[PDB]
Amino acid sequence: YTIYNSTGIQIGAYNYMEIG
Amino acid sequence: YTIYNSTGIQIGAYNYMEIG
Amino acid sequence: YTIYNSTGIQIGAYNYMEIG
């Protein structure tokens, strides 16, 4: 998928996500 | 996908996303 | 999946996620 990002991601799902 | 971003993303899904 | 990111992710699930 070639990300090498620097903060938090999903990759496709059926659930929430939070970053505070 | 060639991202190397610096904060949080989805990649295409059927679920929510939040960043606080 | 070829990530080698630099902060925290899910990979697809049925549960929450938080990063403070």
Curated annotation (Swiss-Prot), chains A, B, C:
PTMs per UniProt: (Microbial infection) Proteolytically cleaved by S.flexneri OspD3 within the RIP homotypic interaction motif (RHIM), leading to its degradation and inhibition of necroptosis. Cleavage is crucial for limiting TNF-induced apoptosis, necroptosis and inflammatory response. Cleavage abolishes NF-kappa-B activation and enhances the interaction of TRADD with FADD. Proteolytically cleaved by CASP6 during intrinsic apoptosis.
Disulfide bridge map: none
Motif (RIP homotypic interaction motif (RHIM)): 1-17
Subcellular location: Cytoplasm; Cell membrane
Superkingdom of origin: Eukaryota
Disorder cited: Immunodeficiency 57 with autoinflammation: An autosomal recessive primary immunodeficiency characterized by lymphopenia and recurrent viral, bacterial, and fungal infections. Patients exhibit early-onset inflammatory bowel disease involving the upper and lower gastrointestinal tract, and develop progressive polyarthritis. Autoinflammation with episodic fever and lymphadenopathy: An autosomal dominant immunologic disorder characterized by early onset of recurrent episodes of unexplained fever, lymphadenopathy, hepatosplenomegaly, and increased levels of inflammatory cytokines and chemokines in patient serum.
Family according to the record: Belongs to the protein kinase superfamily. TKL Ser/Thr protein kinase family.
Domain notes: The RIP homotypic interaction motif (RHIM) mediates interaction with the RHIM motif of RIPK1. Both motifs form a hetero-amyloid serpentine fold, stabilized by hydrophobic packing and featuring an unusual Cys-Ser ladder of alternating Ser (from RIPK1) and Cys (from RIPK3).
Function: Serine-threonine kinase which is a key regulator of TNF-mediated apoptosis, necroptosis and inflammatory pathways. Exhibits kinase activity-dependent functions that regulate cell death and kinase-independent scaffold functions regulating inflammatory signaling and cell survival. Has kinase-independent scaffold functions: upon binding of TNF to TNFR1, RIPK1 is recruited to the TNF-R1 signaling complex (TNF-RSC also known as complex I) where it acts as a scaffold protein promoting cell survival, in part, by activating the canonical NF-kappa-B pathway.
UniProt subunit comment: Homodimer. Interacts (via RIP homotypic interaction motif) with RIPK3 (via RIP homotypic interaction motif); this interaction induces RIPK1 phosphorylation and formation of a RIPK1-RIPK3 necroptosis-inducing complex. Upon TNF-induced necrosis, the RIPK1-RIPK3 dimer further interacts with PGAM5 and MLKL; the formation of this complex leads to PGAM5 phosphorylation and increase in PGAM5 phosphatase activity. Interacts (via the death domain) with TNFRSF6 (via the death domain) and TRADD (via the death domain). Is recruited by TRADD to TNFRSF1A in a TNF-dependent process. (Microbial infection) Interacts with mumps virus protein SH; this interaction inhibits downstream NF-kappa-B pathway activation.
Protein name (database record): Receptor-interacting serine/threonine-protein kinase 1
Gene: RIPK1
Parent-record interval covered: 531 to 550 of 671
